């Protein structure tokens, strides 16, 4: 859909084509994360540390339970009906999450039947069988630390030293816990909390958490880096200091009519200086519509772009016309840096600004020259089978576009400045010119 | 080159002058990082943990080896020639890196002659002598943990507890490893990967890695914070689970004709409110050209600005004229915050907005007043040798500019709004005014 030949002439060389994929239709599993360690077998060497810990931790978890209660207390079976009046104010995400929270409670109530097994857990990871068909896992914070560094050290270190080490381990745990489950978690209802954040409750060990839950392996690692695997806090127990988290495992699906095209920026010659075109590097095409995307929030791999939501955004008509061949509307920024891409390879064809990068032909021994009327030179099979740029020798293929690519030329658009300060300056200076024009026409209208 | 006297009058007080430095001409050393620990002396207490680990780790490293093979399989001795057709699509950075990768292979092949010594390594750090003249270091992940917390705990903790602790240590390692060597590493070829990221393969202990390699101490710490020290993955061994990394150690060189000037923003009076000029805080001057810089990616020290590449960017003509004395073109934003710098010290001269900050003279007992026709007052030796702002008493020097600094005055430029939403709003409202002007002139042309 993009006019790749005219675009490469202005420094935008066709790059890799990737599929557009978005997470959908998740499977769910519940996991129990206990934030308080089991110190039963070092009970004489805890002092008042656990008492201070429980108090401090309650001050972290209570605001979460409260936030969840607002939705739980106002959601009933009809088919789930919410008391919109009692909730008062909510976003769409919170509202749908409020229902998910309510429905999730029904299984949390089954998990809670094992409350005594959850409290009794003394291993970092315990698999509890509810009814054989139903299995829930319990993860315990700092339990491995205690089982290996405090319990077996009973006659290695003093009892008071053991107590101090416990206190510090607990304090360090909270220091990191607070970045996720602290005051920043103004909304524990919305199911958008990435699993790598939730896992801080278990030392940040999300790999253990996920393996524990089994998951599906079709594209597991892409799901994690794209933040598609998330969880929701369903239940908070402030007497036992554990939470129940529902972990969502979405499947990335392909959009049959959508792809993202990467362009490779190449500095090009104009007048007597280097220029770089300011056009989106990643262009999203869906059916017949060319649009933008906030790809900065997506995972980019060799075959696809993996997003945890739809990040498509609007594109202006002037940029769309730029992309379809009206290059007189493609904006360009001056290159002043000594470090800019000056060439790119695409499908065996080499595009280079042979004015700023030294170009020589390996097969003929002759230099490759560029006139002031040319932007980039296209080097292939027909001119130089093997070309040299700087100290790199490249064996080339053939260009499948116009054989007159280097002769036809191209229209060049207006200069721009992308710097934040420059943006404010440019808007202001244009307003001064605009007001002058307004005064001039008003004078003409009064005269006429 | 900058008109510092007119600039200080509009809230831009000359600050610290720093040298412009960029990393270049690196030396290289190869280091081996083994991601799999040696558990030979606890082999009865590993269960199936190492088998699961090897499988999971292979799923992380295989995509890296594959990405490297694309360049390695297509690069040959001529003097290095690349199969541009087979590579198909690449950026300039990848292409030059592809050559570096190929050349690096020649030493990786020597390192690999010690494959059995690499596998046998059971210490966190081992120095291996290849030929006395050639030395390679091997770093092993979690080896110190195992040697101190699992091996010596054989009759301290149970064998199964030891196994569980190993499994968790391995899982935590991968949890962090995945942020660097996971799906996000779409390009392991380009030699732009910061050493602090690579070191995650060794627990994030980059200080050990670097000391191990010796390095040069001229400005080592500046090189690290500026991300000038980087590495490239040269070889991946999926049977032994180790990688060979080439670490680049560049030398920061001074640009003989380039410096960066910092300006210190000071709120100033205009009409009956506070204003702050929106001019770049860090201005890059090279020879006779005034330009911008993305200094947000550079390290700033007392004497120099250290960059890992050239970050110079264009500046508009209106901003350049602002900086050289045409202050009628310097944009200003309204100050509404109660917390803005209201004064600055430069070369012993105090510049203050004595309308918004209370100014008193320590040597005379009299207040320092400012008229509505003045922006900032310049306070020095001639008016008040020691001046007081708020609760701070400052002994001052002498201003070397015009003695009539406080009498001459200055031109003030147009108002701006820098907020992202305000930028979109300002562009739109200007288009409505622009279309009205277009209609008015078209009507005049039809009438005439």
């Amino acid at each position: 859909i993009l006019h790749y030949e005219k675009l490469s002439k202005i420094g935008l060389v066709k790059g890799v084509t990737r599929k557009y994929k978005i997470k959908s239709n998740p499977l769910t599993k519940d996991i129990v994360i206990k934030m308080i360690p089991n110190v039963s077998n070092m009970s004489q060497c805890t002092g008042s540390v656990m008492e201070n810990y429980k108090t401090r931790l309650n001050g972290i978890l209570t605001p979460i339970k409260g936030a969840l209660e607002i939705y739980k207390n106002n959601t009933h079976d009809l088919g789930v009906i919410m008391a919109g009046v009692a909730i008062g104010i909510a976003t769409a995400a919170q509202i749908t999450a409020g229902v998910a929270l309510y429905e999730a409670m029904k299984n949390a109530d089954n998990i809670n039947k094992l409350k005594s097994s959850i409290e009794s857990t003394n291993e970092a990871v315990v698999k509890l069988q509810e009814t054989a068909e139903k299995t829930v896992y319990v993860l315990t914070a700092l339990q491995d630390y205690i089982n290996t560094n405090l319990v077996p050290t009973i006659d290695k270190i003093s009892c008071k030293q053991t107590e101090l080490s416990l206190d510090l381990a607990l304090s360090k745990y909270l220091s990191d816990l607070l970045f996720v489950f602290g005051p920043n978690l103004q909304d524990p209802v919305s199911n958008s909390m990435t699993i790598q954040a939730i896992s801080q409750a278990f030392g940040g060990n999300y790999e253990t958490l996920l393996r524990t839950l089994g998951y599906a392996t079709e594209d597991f690692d892409d799901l994690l880096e794209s933040d598609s695997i998330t969880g929701q806090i369903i239940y908070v127990d402030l007497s036992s200091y554990y939470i129940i988290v529902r972990v969502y495992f979405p499947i990335l699906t392909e959009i049959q009519q959508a792809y993202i095209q990467e362009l490779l920026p190449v500095s090009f010659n104009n007048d007597d200086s280097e220029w770089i075109s300011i056009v989106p590097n990643f262009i999203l095409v869906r059916n017949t519509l060319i649009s933008n995307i906030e790809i900065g929030f997506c995972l980019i791999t060799k075959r696809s772009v993996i997003c945890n939501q739809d990040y498509a955004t609007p594109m202006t008509n002037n940029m769309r016309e730029c992309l379809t061949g009206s290059t007189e509307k493609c904006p360009r920024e001056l290159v002043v840096s000594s470090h800019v891409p000056r060439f790119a390879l695409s499908n065996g064809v080499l595009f280079a600004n042979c004015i700023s990068v030294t170009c020589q032909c390996q097969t003929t021994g002759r230099a490759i020259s560029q006139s002031g009327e040319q932007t980039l030179l296209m080097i292939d099979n027909t001119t130089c089978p093997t070309a040299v740029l700087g100290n790199v020798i490249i064996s080339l293929g053939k260009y499948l576009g116009s054989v007159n690519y280097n002769s036809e030329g191209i229209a060049i658009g207006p200069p721009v400045f992308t710097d934040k300060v420059d943006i404010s300056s440019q808007i202001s200076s244009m307003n001064q010119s605009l007001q002058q024009s307004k005064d001039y026409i008003k004078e003409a209208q009064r005269l006429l | 080159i900058l008109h510092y006297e007119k600039l200080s009058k509009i809230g831009l007080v000359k600050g610290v002058t720093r040298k412009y430095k960029i990393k270049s001409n690196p030396l290289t050393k190869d280091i081996v990082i083994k991601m799999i620990p040696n558990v030979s002396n606890m082999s009865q207490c590993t269960g199936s943990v190492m088998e699961n680990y090897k499988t999971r780790l292979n799923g992380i490293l295989t995509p890296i080896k594959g990405a490297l093979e694309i360049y390695k399989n297509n690069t040959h001795d001529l003097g290095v020639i690349m199969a541009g057709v087979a590579i198909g699509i690449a950026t300039a950075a990848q292409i030059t890196a592809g050559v570096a990768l190929y050349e690096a292979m020649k030493n990786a092949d020597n390192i690999n002659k010690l494959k059995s010594s690499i596998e046998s390594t059971n210490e966190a750090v081992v120095k291996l002598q290849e030929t006395a003249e050639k030395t390679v270091y091997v770093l092993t992940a979690l080896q110190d943990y195992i040697n101190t917390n699992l091996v010596p705990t054989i009759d301290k903790i149970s064998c199964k507890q030891t196994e569980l602790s190993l499994d968790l240590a391995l899982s935590k390692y991968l949890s962090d490893l995945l942020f660097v060597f996971g799906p996000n590493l779409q390009d392991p070829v380009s030699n732009s990967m910061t050493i602090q990221a690579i070191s995650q393969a060794f627990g994030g202990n980059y200080e050990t890695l670097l000391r191990t390699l010796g390095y040069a101490t001229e400005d080592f710490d500046d090189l690290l914070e500026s991300d000038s020290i980087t590495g490239q993955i040269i070889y991946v061994d999926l049977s032994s689970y180790y990688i060979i990394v080439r670490v680049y150690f560049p030398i920061l060189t001074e640009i003989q004709q380039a410096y960066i000037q910092e300006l210190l923003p000071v709120s100033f009076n205009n009409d009956d409110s506070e204003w702050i000029s929106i001019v770049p805080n860090f201005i890059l001057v090279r020879n006779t050209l005034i330009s911008n810089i993305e200094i947000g990616f550079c390290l700033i020290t007392k004497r120099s600005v250290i960059c890992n590449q050239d970050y110079a960017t264009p500046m508009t003509n209106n901003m350049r004229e602002c900086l050289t004395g045409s202050t009628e073109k310097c944009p200003r934003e309204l100050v509404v915050s109660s917390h803005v710098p209201r004064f600055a010290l430069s070369n012993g001269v105090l510049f203050a907005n004595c309308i918004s900050v209370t100014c008193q003279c320590q040597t005379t007992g009299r207040a320092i007043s400012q008229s509505g026709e003045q922006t900032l007052l310049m306070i020095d030796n001639t008016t008040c040798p020691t001046a007081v702002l708020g609760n701070v008493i400052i002994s001052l020097g002498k201003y070397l500019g015009s003695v009539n600094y406080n009498s001459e005055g200055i031109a003030i430029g147009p108002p701006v709004f820098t907020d992202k939403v305000d930028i979109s709003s300002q562009i739109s409202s200007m288009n409505q005014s622009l279309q009205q002007s277009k209609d008015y002139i078209k009507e005049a042309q039809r009438l005439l």
């Epitope: 089991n38 077998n41 857990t121 291993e123 315990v126 509890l128 089982n147 | 009759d155 149970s158 507890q161």
Partner: antibody, heavy 117, light 105 residues
Framework: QVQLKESGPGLVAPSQSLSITCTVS????????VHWVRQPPGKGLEWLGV???????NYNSALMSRLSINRDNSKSQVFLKLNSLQTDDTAIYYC?????????????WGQGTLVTV | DIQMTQSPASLSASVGETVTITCRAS??????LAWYQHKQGKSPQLLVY???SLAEGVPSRFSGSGSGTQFSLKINSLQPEDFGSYYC?????????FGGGTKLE
């Protein structure tokens, strides 16, 4: 106090499965592991397999293809199963609790249930 | 798996005499060895764990020692109630295993 009590079938034919349930009290199955041991008429004690505190299991090599262990953390029970019996599987089967964090020393044993094949 | 050899197969000793039982492992099991006293009609009683420590409730006439591959159990004053089959168990690697046992009259 701590107790373990085995309950299961007496005479079971060859080629039939065996299912013995150990009901426990005085401790949580989330805190301690449970091991199964048998005593054949003229042999020594034979360790069969274990279900660990963590809910995972291990078996000896001889019975690895026939022996399975499971749990119920709601009813405080541990389940010993053999998929197919031989006449030499005649033995008294015992349920025993391990010591804390997977340490050996079967301080606590059940009563023992005699299985005839 | 890890095999264990326990001997003598059968012992005869009078009341008040010192009685010892020897057990060796086919591999290195560090201090991971337990001893049991098993009477017929009853479940086995734990006597010693980690090759030396008595189980709570076990009479102090019992003691033991050992390391790696060579271990032993000692009774410093045999009582009438000490008749029974004694078992040597390792609990290092997996599976845990028992020896043939010693029958003490």
């Amino acid at each position: 106090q701590v107790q373990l009590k085995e309950s299961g079938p007496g005479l079971v034919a060859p080629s039939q499965s065996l299912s013995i349930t150990c009901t426990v009290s005085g401790f949580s199955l989330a805190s301690y592991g449970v091991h199964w041991v048998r005593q054949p008429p003229g042999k020594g004690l034979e360790w069969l397999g274990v279900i660990w505190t963590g809910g995972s299991t291990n078996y000896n090599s001889a019975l690895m293809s026939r022996l399975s262990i499971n749990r119920d953390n709601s009813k405080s029970q541990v389940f010993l199963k053999l998929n197919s019996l031989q006449t030499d599987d005649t033995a008294i089967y015992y349920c025993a609790r391990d010591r804390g964090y997977g340490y050996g020393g079967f301080a606590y044993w059940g009563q023992g249930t005699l299985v005839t094949v | 798996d890890i095999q264990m050899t326990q001997s003598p197969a059968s012992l005869s000793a009078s009341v008040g005499e010192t009685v010892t039982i020897t057990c060796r492992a086919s591999e290195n099991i560090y201090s991971y060895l337990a001893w049991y006293q098993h009477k017929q009609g009853k479940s086995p009683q734990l006597l010693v764990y980690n090759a030396k420590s008595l189980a709570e409730g076990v009479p102090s006439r019992f003691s033991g020692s050992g390391s790696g591959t060579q271990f032993s159990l000692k009774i410093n004053s045999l009582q009438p109630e000490d008749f029974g089959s004694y078992y040597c168990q390792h609990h290092y690697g997996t599976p845990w295993t028992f020896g043939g046992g010693t029958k003490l009259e």
